Amino acid sequence: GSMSEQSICQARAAVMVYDDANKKWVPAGGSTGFSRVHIYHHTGNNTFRVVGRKIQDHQVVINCAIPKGLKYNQATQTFHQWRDARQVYGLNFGSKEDANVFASAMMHALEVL
Numbered sequence: 001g002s003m004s005e006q007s008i009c010q011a012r013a014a015v016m017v018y019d020d021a022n023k024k025w026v027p028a029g030g031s032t033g034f035s036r037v038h039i040y041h042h043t044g045n046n047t048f049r050v051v052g053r054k055i056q057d058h059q060v061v062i063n064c065a066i067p068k069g070l071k072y073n074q075a076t077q078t079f080h081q082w083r084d085a086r087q088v089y090g091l092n093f094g095s096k097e098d099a100n101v102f103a104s105a106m107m108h109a110l111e112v113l
């Protein structure tokens with residue numbers, strides 16, 4: 001938390017999860033809109049996670065570990081995505097600057113893990 005984790009970036013993005021059964025992206029957490037998406041570094045054990053909160057109502061729409069070896073796909077300059085055993089996640093960034101901020105922090109996490 002506040003004492004164990006440190007934010008290494010903030011970026012604006014609509015967070016989406018892939019509905020594998022329907023072959024469609026769905027808003028993470030149930031409602032379409034932009035979130036503030038952090039990567040948080042647990043400095044103690046050198047782990048990272050992605051945490052995003054809807055700007056409007058503060059709902060946490062994503063909270064997922066970044067595992068070592070993750071393949072992070074920059075599909076376009078403003079839409080990046082990744083997978084784990086359970087979900088495919090997509091970040092539709094509000095600008096290329098946000099995309100670069102977040103990708104730059106994710107790529108750091110992946111090299112230091």
Ligand SMILES: CC(=O)N[C@@H](Cc1ccccc1Cl)C(=O)N1CCC[C@]12C=C[C@@H]1CC[C@@H](C(=O)N3CCC[C@@H]4C=C[C@H]5CC[C@@H](C(=O)O)N5C(=O)[C@H]43)N1C2=O
Nearest residue numbers: 016018025071072073075076079081082083088089090092
């Ligand atoms: C082997 C594998 O798993 N491959 C993954 C990718 C991957 C590769 C390597 C490592 C991890 C991963 Cl994750 C894969 O390809 N995946 C993950 C499931 C989703 C998808 C599969 C098919 C569709 C084709 C279309 C494409 C897609 O979704 N978009 C294209 C460009 C961005 C464009 C942007 C936004 C969203 C807003 C909704 C819709 C729209 O804009 O209307 N849309 C889009 O159309 C978006 N797909 C994918 O990304």
